[PDB]
A paper describes a structure:
CRISPR-associated DinG protein (CasDinG) is essential to type IV-A CRISPR function. Here, we demonstrate that CasDinG from Pseudomonas aeruginosa strain 83 is an ATP-dependent 5′-3′ DNA translocase that unwinds double-stranded (ds)DNA and RNA/DNA hybrids. The crystal structure of CasDinG reveals a superfamily 2 helicase core of two RecA-like domains with three accessory domains (N-terminal, arch, and vestigial FeS). CasDinG is an essential component of the type IV-A CRISPR Cas system, which clears bacteria of invasive nucleic acid and silences gene expression.
Numbering used by the authors: 104 to 230, 235 to 309, 323 to 726
The structure:
């Protein structure tokens, strides 16, 4: 209550010592790893840290996704020092998508939910924000919640987009309200795009040196960086756009694109393997094609092209050049198995970019509920974010008793090992049907693939009917979340066969009871069908496993698993929470299942 940080009285009691340690280690120039349980009030802690740093005179940047950005703004504006120093939102173009190209892609890939969201105006899905300029639509994060495999490289809002575009107009209207404030709030994608732009030089305007950086939900940061260095070449819309231009240079570009298509099919059939990402040296059939594809793309004149063709051809050239850089790993999707022709080029190492970020950062604090793999072991996270080992500071985690006290772990499990077989599907569906018959509220059932989900759906559909919500490629995660909330509100007890984002991001606390968490029954039964092994399909995870062995696989599996468990208790004061783990390998007496058996032992069984 004296000689304290701004807004520290609003920070919950449990996070105050962690707050003090983070403040100290950050002012000393260290990259702090502060893991705190969800529902403890991490937003107030972030607000107090940013306020203490901004009062000192530092340039403070808080990088957080837009979902939590609203509540972060609310928690920061409550601090008077923050309101005095100023708080702005650096909403650069990489935050927004192009409605035209996103709608076209959704149509070409038969993603009805994404098409409907674009047609409806791209309105915010989760979010509210009323005193920060206008309403934020066309957000990349919502689009990703509607299509996890969104080729964001080729669907982002560019400066070459027409002025009458809604996303462009929203960006310009937001940029007009941008002032030089003490605290700048950005997204993970904004921070990563800014770092990449700053490196490629040696509207995007972040401080060239971040005195104090505060990353919230830091377990997403790397993925953001990974997305910013991904390049996508979508051949069908590019070919269509070129078909809609003057014939002076149309024929050569179209013939070069068809040559590239044929060479991509050749390389695809050259070695099927298992969706393997190969360098350009392993598929030389694309080297001339790609080269030709670039030349013709620059040959046709801009005197006659609209802004749409301009941005499309520029993005295509950037992608084809990043493919021919040799520093990338390629993934081909063509006629044999993918109706939508596409060439992906990613970076299996983000070390230079993240090091450029940390070199331009005086001090930093990373906040999340899943920073450590076990205890305070942030080694996997440090490696992912490429934090210099001398600057990393693994503070103790904060996970109170209420995060597991209302939870009762059940002894029942599916005896047949998860082998993607119809027999496993039958047994696991019998188990899920039992859990659904006993369940008092909404039931979430996490799966590891679309195939397991389809089998479990074919079983549980005839049994449940009104209650079942099957996630798929067409049925996004957001539409399933909305169906879940609606069916729970109607009195039905829904059973959501979820995957993907259902493991990592969704907030299943009933917002109809913000002051009475004792009556929260929105998610009463969490069910884990499989240990999430092999769910990370990033190039950096491929390199990390190739270097460190099966320990990286096991640590990523435990990280994903603890995230999935973190969907059940989202706040204190809840009750009647049930946890189910059906993977027979847990109770199999193996060696690699020892980490998981730790967390599950931490609960109380019944």
């Amino acid at each position: 209550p004296a000689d304290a940080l701004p807004g520290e009285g609003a920070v919950r009691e449990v996070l105050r010592p962690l707050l003090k340690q983070a403040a100290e280690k950050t002012a000393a120039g260290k990259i702090v790893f502060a893991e705190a349980a969800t529902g403890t009030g991490k937003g107030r802690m972030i607000a107090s840290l940013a306020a203490a740093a901004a009062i000192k005179g530092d340039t403070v940047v808080v990088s957080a996704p837009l979902a939590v950005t609203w509540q972060l703004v609310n928690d920061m504006k409550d601090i008077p020092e923050v309101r005095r120093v100023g708080l702005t939102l650096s909403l650069g173009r990489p935050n927004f998508i192009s409605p035209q190209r996103t709608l076209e892609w959704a149509i070409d890939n038969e993603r009805a939910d994404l098409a409907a969201w674009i047609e409806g105006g791209g309105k915010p899905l989760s979010l509210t924000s009323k005193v920060i300029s206008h309403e934020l639509c066309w957000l990349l994060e919502d689009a990703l919640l509607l299509a996890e495999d969104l080729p964001a490289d080729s669907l982002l809002l560019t400066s070459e987009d027409p002025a009458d575009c809604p996303a462009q107009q929203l960006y310009v209207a937001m940029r007009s309200n941008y002032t030089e404030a003490g605290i700048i709030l950005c997204s993970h994608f904004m921070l990563a795009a800014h770092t990449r732009m700053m490196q490629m030089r040696g509207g995007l305007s972040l401080p060239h040196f971040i005195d104090t950086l505060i990353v919230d939900e830091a377990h997403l940061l790397e993925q953001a960086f990974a997305s910013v260095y991904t390049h996508t070449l979508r051949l069908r819309p590019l070919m269509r756009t070129i078909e809609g231009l003057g014939s002076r240079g149309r024929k050569p570009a179209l013939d070069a694109l068809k040559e590239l298509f044929t060479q991509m099919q050749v390389a695809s059939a050259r070695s099927t393997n298992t969706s393997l990402n190969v360098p350009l040296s392993d598929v030389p059939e694309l080297i001339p094609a790609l080269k030709d594809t670039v030349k013709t793309l620059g040959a046709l004149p801009t005197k006659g092209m609209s802004r749409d063709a301009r941005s499309v051809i520029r993005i295509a050239t950037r992608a084809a050049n990043d493919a021919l850089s040799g520093h990338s790993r390629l993934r081909i999707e063509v006629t044999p198995v993918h109706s939508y022709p596409m060439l992906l080029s990613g970076r299996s190492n983000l070390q230079r970019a993240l090091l450029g970020l940390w070199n331009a950062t005086g001090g930093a604090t990373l906040v999340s509920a899943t920073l450590f793999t076990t205890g305070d072991n942030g080694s996997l996270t440090r490696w992912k974010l490429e934090v210099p080992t001398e600057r990393a500071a693994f503070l103790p985690p904060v996970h109170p008793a209420w995060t597991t006290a209302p939870v009762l772990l059940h002894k029942e499990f599916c005896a047949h090992e998860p082998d993607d077989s119809p027999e496993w599907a039958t047994e696991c569906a019998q188990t899920i049907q039992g859990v659904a018959s006993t369940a008092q509220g909404g039931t979430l059932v996490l799966c590891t693939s679309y195939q397991n989900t389809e089998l479990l759906a074919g079983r549980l559909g005839a049994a449940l009917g009104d209650r079942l919500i099957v996630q798929s490629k067409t049925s996004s995660a957001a539409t399933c979340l909305a169906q879940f909330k609606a069916k729970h509100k109607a009195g039905i007890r829904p059973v959501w066969l979820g995957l993907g984002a259902a493991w990592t991001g969704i907030d299943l606390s009933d917002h109809s009871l913000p002051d009475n968490p004792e009556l929260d029954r929105l998610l009463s039964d969490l069910v884990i069908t499989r240990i999430p092994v092999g769910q990370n399909r990033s190039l950096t995870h491929e390199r990390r496993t190739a270097i460190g062995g099966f320990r990286i696989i096991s640590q990523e599996a435990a990280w994903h698993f603890r995230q999935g468990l973190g969907r059940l208790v989202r706040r204190p004061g809840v009750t009647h929470k049930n946890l189910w783990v059906l993977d027979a390998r847990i109770y199999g007496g193996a060696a690699w299942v020892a980490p998981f058996r730790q967390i599950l032992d931490r609960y109380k069984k019944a």
